[PDB]
Amino acid sequence: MKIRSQVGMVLNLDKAIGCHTCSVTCKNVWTSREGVEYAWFNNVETKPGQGFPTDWENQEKYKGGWIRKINGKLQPRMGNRAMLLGKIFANPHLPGIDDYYEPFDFDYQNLHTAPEGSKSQPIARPRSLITGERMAKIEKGPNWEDDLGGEFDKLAKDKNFDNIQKAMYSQFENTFMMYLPRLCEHCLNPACVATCPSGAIYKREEDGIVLIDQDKCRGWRMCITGCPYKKIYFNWKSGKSEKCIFCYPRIEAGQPTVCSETCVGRIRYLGVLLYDADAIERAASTENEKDLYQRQLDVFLDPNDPKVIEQAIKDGIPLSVIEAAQQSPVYKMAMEWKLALPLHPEYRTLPMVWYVPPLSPIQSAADAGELGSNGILPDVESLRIPVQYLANLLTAGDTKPVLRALKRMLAMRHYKRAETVDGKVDTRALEEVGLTEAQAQEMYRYLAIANYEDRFVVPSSHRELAREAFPEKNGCGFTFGDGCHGSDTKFNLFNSRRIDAIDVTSKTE
């Protein structure tokens, strides 16, 4: 039993509007440099589709995540330590730039400088940001499949259509589409950390954010294959890999991530989750992959349980973090209401960015239909998005937890309609799904009204703990180049001293 904390995230796909605002803000702040222009730490994909990079969910092809060997031990799908090292001279599974898209720009200046007497109206043609050469045509982009862009037979190659008779969905009347925004899952059992030969990737103890040390990374580019979500992008210029940093500079002071605060649909929630680090391997190595979801819930600890609280304090968790954990919207959605589910738990990484499945228009039928258990509102069985597709995406193929989430959302709607339209109390739907009026009202508070203070409950990462914040406050930022940052040993060849430190020791004790 070793308690650690992390700010998890929940995205309500039912409220998702697939606008990509989250992607643009992240891009502007973190990846507008040459080398990562093609990398979208946060990217939104329209489903059905193969995504970015193409077919990233196909682990047989990309070799991401973990496998559970016959002896019960975990091993990266990429191979054990020796197998992985044997692939270092040329990663055989590495995604190529074309699996993402060839980054491009346009010759806008031609519009300004076109010479007098041009035979035709000047135009701005595409040019490659990789070679600087003219591109005859743009054939791919990071969001090429947006809103079912492409023939169904192409989009339907979607890994999540596995075990589903998808023919019926190629019919106009049965058309369906949803949005899947995603970033790094900042896993409890990250496959990236395990597949980096240099040990440059690590999970921060205090807030669970997973980072690639830009000093220590040696550019072995094996981690890219290791990540089953393909959320690590090689910086082709620096020769090192980069990934979503969960906006730690903001999180550290209690602010939401950029993609969370800028989410226009108001579908992202941030809240602390306390977990038992000592149970990570046991949970991730459970025999049946359909048990990974529940096994992970079992690693999450009850923040209102004095036993957990006292253990947390003993393990160094700050009081403000424990407090935040007690009013975590993420804990309520994943643990209490069972509305949020992990993304591909079968990869065995114990992801920390979860999703509430989306509702959808009722399916095509013979007639206009009849009043169901929910009156004029939909019954879970009538939704047009095949539940098996959602289960392949969130619960390793088990439709049970997906149906529960969807039914509970619809139940809340039924209950609230009786209240706001009929002015009556009708808990029939809630009782059918095991929800109390109090739970439905709280669900409504967080999901419908969704006040800012309720969507984001991020505590400080307390940078003052175990460090020296005073000298840092006084001297951080003066980047003159003292050459003494980044090492604990004081000796340095350039005979310098840290600008933000105190060299003259107190002699009065």
Ligand X SMILES: CCCCCCCC(=O)O[C@H](COC(=O)CCCC)COP(=O)([O-])OC[C@@H](O)CO
What is the rounded CA–CA span in Å between residue 101 and residue 30? 19
**Of 173, 287, 503, 509, which lies in the binding site for other proteins, with binding defined by CB under 8 A?**
503
Nearest to 3 by CA among 274, 367, 251, 395: 274
Span near ligand SF4 by CB under 6 A; candidates 163-171, 189-197, 363-371, 457-465 = 189-197
What is the rounded CA–CA span in Å between residue 152 and residue 47? 11
Span near ligand F3S by CB under 6 A; candidates 14-22, 95-103, 104-112, 339-347 = 14-22
Q: Does 461 bind ligand SF4 (CB under 6 A)?
A: no
Which structure tokens are listed for 150?
């492409």
Q: Does 88 bind ligand HEM (CB under 6 A)?
A: yes
The number of residues making up the chain comes to 509
Omega into 318 within 30° of 0, i.e. cis? no
What is the rounded CA–CA span in Å between residue 300 and residue 280? 10
Choose among other proteins, a second copy, ligand F3S, none what residue 223 binds, the Cβ cut-off being 5 to 8 Å by kind.
ligand F3S
Residues in contact with a second copy, total (CB under 8 A)? 36
Rg (CA), the chain: 25
Q: Does 26 bind ligand SF4 (CB under 6 A)?
A: yes
Choose among a second copy, ligand HEM, ligand X, none what residue 198 binds, the Cβ cut-off being 5 to 8 Å by kind.
ligand X
Nearest to 208 by CA among 181, 186, 193, 241: 186
Span near ligand HEM by CB under 6 A; candidates 86-94, 157-165, 380-388, 464-472 = 86-94
What is the rounded CA–CA span in Å between residue 267 and residue 19? 12
Span near ligand HEM by CB under 6 A; candidates 83-91, 132-140, 419-427, 475-483 = 83-91
Phi, psi of 10 (to 5 degrees): -125, 130
224 to 243, contacts with ligand F3S by CB under 6 A? 240-241
Question: Does residue 352 sit in helix, strand or coil?
Answer: coil
Phi, psi of 76 (to 5 degrees): -60, 140
**Of 47, 186, 221, 455, which lies in the binding site for ligand SF4, with binding defined by CB under 6 A?**
186
Q: Does 210 bind ligand SF4 (CB under 6 A)?
A: yes
Report CA 114 to chain centroid distance, whole Å: 45
Give burial (CB, 10 Å; 0-12/13-18/19+) of 60: exposed
Cβ proximity to ligand HEM, 90 vs 371, nearer residue: 90
**Within 13 A of 212's CA, how many CA atoms are on the CB side?**
29
What is the rounded CA–CA span in Å between residue 211 and residue 164? 37
Choose among ligand SF4, ligand X, ligand F3S, none what residue 41 binds, the Cβ cut-off being 5 to 8 Å by kind.
ligand SF4
Nearest to 415 by CA among 404, 429, 403, 405: 429
Q: Does 245 bind ligand SF4 (CB under 6 A)?
A: yes
Nearest to 498 by CA among 488, 506, 507: 488
Q: Does 373 bind ligand X (CB under 6 A)?
A: no
Q: Does 43 bind ligand F3S (CB under 6 A)?
A: no
Q: Identify the residue whose tokens are 């992970």.
A: 296
**Of 30, 100, 234, 300, which lies in the binding site for ligand SF4, with binding defined by CB under 6 A?**
30
Q: Does 64 bind ligand F3S (CB under 6 A)?
A: no
Cβ proximity to a second copy, 215 vs 488, nearer residue: 215
Cβ proximity to ligand HEM, 108 vs 494, nearer residue: 494
Cβ proximity to ligand F3S, 243 vs 295, nearer residue: 243
Alpha carbon dihedral 79, 158, 352, 41, in 10-degree steps, equals: 90
Choose among ligand HEM, ligand SF4, ligand F3S, none what residue 181 binds, the Cβ cut-off being 5 to 8 Å by kind.
ligand F3S
472 to 491, contacts with other proteins by CB under 8 A? 472-473, 476-483, 485-489, 491
Site residues for ligand HEM per CB under 6 A? 88-90, 220
Site residues for ligand X per CB under 6 A? 198-199, 216, 218
Site residues for ligand F3S per CB under 6 A? 11, 16-22, 44, 181, 196-198, 200-201, 212, 217-223, 240-241, 263-265, 267-268
